[PDB]
Write an enzyme that holds these catalytic residues in place. Structure first.
Site, PDB file in Angstrom:
ATOM      1  N   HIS A   1     -20.804   5.298 -13.214  1.00 29.34           N
ATOM      2  CA  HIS A   1     -19.550   5.843 -13.722  1.00 29.34           C
ATOM      3  C   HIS A   1     -19.680   7.302 -14.150  1.00 29.34           C
ATOM      4  O   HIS A   1     -18.648   7.986 -14.321  1.00 29.34           O
ATOM      5  CB  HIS A   1     -19.001   4.927 -14.832  1.00 29.34           C
TER       6      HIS A   1
ATOM      7  N   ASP B   1     -23.387  -0.754 -12.188  1.00 28.36           N
ATOM      8  CA  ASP B   1     -23.083   0.555 -12.739  1.00 28.36           C
ATOM      9  C   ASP B   1     -24.330   1.433 -12.796  1.00 28.36           C
ATOM     10  O   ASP B   1     -24.520   2.199 -13.750  1.00 28.36           O
ATOM     11  CB  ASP B   1     -22.428   0.459 -14.126  1.00 28.36           C
TER      12      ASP B   1
ATOM     13  N   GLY C   1     -20.983   9.884 -24.277  1.00 30.22           N
ATOM     14  CA  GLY C   1     -21.880  10.813 -23.619  1.00 30.22           C
ATOM     15  C   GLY C   1     -23.323  10.371 -23.622  1.00 30.22           C
ATOM     16  O   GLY C   1     -24.185  11.143 -23.197  1.00 30.22           O
TER      17      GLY C   1
ATOM     18  N   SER D   1     -24.290   7.180 -22.206  1.00 32.46           N
ATOM     19  CA  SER D   1     -24.584   6.318 -21.074  1.00 32.46           C
ATOM     20  C   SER D   1     -25.727   6.935 -20.280  1.00 32.46           C
ATOM     21  O   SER D   1     -25.853   8.166 -20.177  1.00 32.46           O
ATOM     22  CB  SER D   1     -23.348   6.096 -20.202  1.00 32.46           C
TER      23      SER D   1
HETATM   24  C1  LIG Z   1     -13.942   0.822 -23.993  1.00 31.09           C
HETATM   25  C2  LIG Z   1     -15.200   1.635 -23.584  1.00 31.09           C
HETATM   26  C3  LIG Z   1     -16.091   1.809 -24.829  1.00 31.09           C
HETATM   27  C4  LIG Z   1     -14.785   3.032 -23.070  1.00 31.09           C
HETATM   28  C5  LIG Z   1     -15.903   0.849 -22.471  1.00 31.09           C
HETATM   29  N1  LIG Z   1     -16.332  -0.451 -22.900  1.00 31.09           N
HETATM   30  C6  LIG Z   1     -16.400  -1.538 -21.961  1.00 31.09           C
HETATM   31  O1  LIG Z   1     -15.975  -1.420 -20.833  1.00 31.09           O
HETATM   32  O2  LIG Z   1     -17.021  -2.734 -22.436  1.00 31.09           O
HETATM   33  C7  LIG Z   1     -17.009  -3.824 -21.605  1.00 31.09           C
HETATM   34  C8  LIG Z   1     -17.270  -5.046 -22.485  1.00 31.09           C
HETATM   35  C9  LIG Z   1     -18.764  -4.984 -22.665  1.00 31.09           C
HETATM   36  C10 LIG Z   1     -19.343  -4.485 -21.387  1.00 31.09           C
HETATM   37  C11 LIG Z   1     -18.196  -3.798 -20.650  1.00 31.09           C
HETATM   38  O3  LIG Z   1     -17.901  -4.496 -19.499  1.00 31.09           O
HETATM   39  C12 LIG Z   1     -17.222  -3.721 -18.517  1.00 31.09           C
HETATM   40  C13 LIG Z   1     -18.234  -2.817 -17.766  1.00 31.09           C
HETATM   41  C14 LIG Z   1     -18.113  -1.484 -17.869  1.00 31.09           C
HETATM   42  C15 LIG Z   1     -19.088  -0.569 -17.143  1.00 31.09           C
HETATM   43  F1  LIG Z   1     -19.732   0.222 -18.090  1.00 31.09           F
HETATM   44  F2  LIG Z   1     -20.079  -1.252 -16.521  1.00 31.09           F
HETATM   45  C16 LIG Z   1     -18.408   0.351 -16.097  1.00 31.09           C
HETATM   46  N2  LIG Z   1     -18.739   0.250 -14.812  1.00 31.09           N
HETATM   47  C17 LIG Z   1     -18.150   1.108 -13.911  1.00 31.09           C
HETATM   48  C18 LIG Z   1     -18.498   1.009 -12.511  1.00 31.09           C
HETATM   49  C19 LIG Z   1     -17.895   1.902 -11.615  1.00 31.09           C
HETATM   50  C20 LIG Z   1     -16.979   2.854 -12.071  1.00 31.09           C
HETATM   51  C21 LIG Z   1     -16.651   2.958 -13.420  1.00 31.09           C
HETATM   52  C22 LIG Z   1     -17.252   2.045 -14.339  1.00 31.09           C
HETATM   53  N3  LIG Z   1     -16.925   2.161 -15.662  1.00 31.09           N
HETATM   54  C23 LIG Z   1     -17.493   1.322 -16.527  1.00 31.09           C
HETATM   55  O4  LIG Z   1     -17.195   1.367 -17.902  1.00 31.09           O
HETATM   56  C24 LIG Z   1     -16.532   2.530 -18.347  1.00 31.09           C
HETATM   57  C25 LIG Z   1     -17.498   3.608 -18.740  1.00 31.09           C
HETATM   58  C26 LIG Z   1     -18.123   3.004 -19.916  1.00 31.09           C
HETATM   59  C27 LIG Z   1     -18.536   3.982 -21.025  1.00 31.09           C
HETATM   60  O5  LIG Z   1     -17.722   4.656 -21.654  1.00 31.09           O
HETATM   61  N4  LIG Z   1     -19.945   4.059 -21.285  1.00 31.09           N
HETATM   62  C28 LIG Z   1     -20.511   4.870 -22.381  1.00 31.09           C
HETATM   63  C29 LIG Z   1     -20.571   6.382 -22.302  1.00 31.09           C
HETATM   64  O6  LIG Z   1     -21.088   7.065 -23.138  1.00 31.09           O
HETATM   65  N5  LIG Z   1     -20.017   6.888 -21.101  1.00 31.09           N
HETATM   66  S1  LIG Z   1     -20.068   8.506 -20.944  1.00 31.09           S
HETATM   67  O7  LIG Z   1     -21.407   9.114 -21.044  1.00 31.09           O
HETATM   68  O8  LIG Z   1     -19.196   9.107 -22.048  1.00 31.09           O
HETATM   69  C30 LIG Z   1     -19.201   8.960 -19.407  1.00 31.09           C
HETATM   70  C31 LIG Z   1     -17.772   8.397 -19.194  1.00 31.09           C
HETATM   71  C32 LIG Z   1     -19.528  10.374 -18.932  1.00 31.09           C
HETATM   72  C33 LIG Z   1     -20.097   9.147 -18.178  1.00 31.09           C
HETATM   73  C34 LIG Z   1     -21.661   4.223 -23.175  1.00 31.09           C
HETATM   74  C35 LIG Z   1     -20.242   4.244 -23.747  1.00 31.09           C
HETATM   75  C36 LIG Z   1     -20.053   5.163 -24.976  1.00 31.09           C
HETATM   76  F3  LIG Z   1     -18.798   5.680 -24.981  1.00 31.09           F
HETATM   77  F4  LIG Z   1     -20.191   4.305 -26.027  1.00 31.09           F
HETATM   78  N6  LIG Z   1     -17.041   2.200 -20.597  1.00 31.09           N
HETATM   79  C37 LIG Z   1     -15.866   2.152 -19.650  1.00 31.09           C
HETATM   80  C38 LIG Z   1     -17.125   1.600 -21.932  1.00 31.09           C
HETATM   81  O9  LIG Z   1     -18.158   1.696 -22.550  1.00 31.09           O
END
Ligand SMILES: CC(C)(C)[C@@H]1NC(=O)O[C@@H]2CCC[C@H]2OC/C=C/C(F)(F)c2nc3ccccc3nc2O[C@@H]2C[C@@H](C(=O)N[C@]3(C(=O)NS(=O)(=O)C4(C)CC4)C[C@H]3C(F)F)N(C2)C1=O
Ligand SMILES: [Zn+2]
Length: 200
Positions: free
Chosen positions: A78, A102, A158, A160
């Site tokens: 993602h 992911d 930020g 992940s």
């Molecule tokens: C509500 C919420 C907190 C935003 C969301 N919760 C949530 O979905 O929880 C459910 C229930 C428990 C597990 C999860 O099951 C769903 C699986 C989600 C996934 F992760 F597998 C995912 N697979 C994808 C595959 C292809 C394309 C997009 C995808 N998008 C995904 O998820 C999305 C992204 C992920 C995210 O924000 N990750 C973080 C982060 O820092 N990102 S980042 O660096 O800023 C950035 C966006 C720059 C890259 C660590 C969390 C931080 F913010 F804490 N998400 C949404 C969330 O965490």
């Protein structure tokens, strides 16, 4: 679009810093500013020396982390999509891509250090964030852990692609998503290192 001659190319993921874990204090270091990041994303040519296990990476629109385990720099799909990563000799194509997990991975950059996969079977973990915060996490399942002290989602945004570590400093998993209610992250979801080892 239907005009291929003007179709654009997405840039490379670019290493812009690292989380320094080599001493007694964890701290973030920036190694490239936003302008140089932009230039490096387009060329795919990054001549900076890479150090450490946890990198801060960026695209034109996102910033997140990437973690070296067993000679592979891993991060989240993602964040990176199918993008190449910039390197001294140009763009490097992913060697692992699994949207269902992911998960993506490139060969680990020359000069990086790799974490060892954990075989401890321990449930007392530590999440490392892009701000070099070390957050105790109790393991609660194959891919879940609870924060001992919950924190607003803003403090985890930020991060992940960052590691969860065991008490010995082995890699247990890669931070994927947060479990939050009313904006408070009470738990985290991560890609277990065994799932990386199977993907390998
Ligand atoms: C509500 C919420 C907190 C935003 C969301 N919760 C949530 O979905 O929880 C459910 C229930 C428990 C597990 C999860 O099951 C769903 C699986 C989600 C996934 F992760 F597998 C995912 N697979 C994808 C595959 C292809 C394309 C997009 C995808 N998008 C995904 O998820 C999305 C992204 C992920 C995210 O924000 N990750 C973080 C982060 O820092 N990102 S980042 O660096 O800023 C950035 C966006 C720059 C890259 C660590 C969390 C931080 F913010 F804490 N998400 C949404 C969330 O965490
Ligand atoms: Zn261990």
């Amino acid at each position: 679009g239907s005009h291929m001659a003007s179709m654009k190319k997405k840039g490379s993921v670019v290493i812009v810093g690292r989380i320094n874990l080599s001493g007694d204090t964890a701290y973030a270091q920036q190694t490239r500013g936003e302008e140089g990041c932009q230039e490096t994303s387009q060329t795919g040519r990054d001549k900076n020396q890479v150090e450490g296990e946890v990198q801060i990476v960026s695209t034109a629109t996102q910033t997140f982390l990437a973690t070296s385990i067993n000679g592979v720099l891993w991060t989240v799909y993602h964040g990176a999509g199918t993008r190449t990563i910039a390197s001294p000799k140009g763009p490097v194509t992913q060697m692992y891509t699994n949207v269902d997990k992911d998960l993506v991975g490139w060969q680990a950059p020359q000069g990086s250090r790799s974490l060892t996969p954990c075989t401890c079977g321990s449930s007392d973990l530590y999440l490392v964030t892009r701000h070099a915060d070390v957050i105790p996490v109790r393991r609660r399942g194959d891919s879940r852990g609870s924060l001992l002290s919950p924190r607003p989602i803003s403090y985890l945004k930020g991060s992940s692609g960052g590691p969860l570590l065991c008490p010995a400093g082995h890699a247990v998993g890669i931070f994927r998503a947060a479990v939050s209610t009313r904006g408070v992250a009470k738990a985290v979801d991560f890609i277990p290192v065994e799932s990386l080892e199977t993907t390998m």
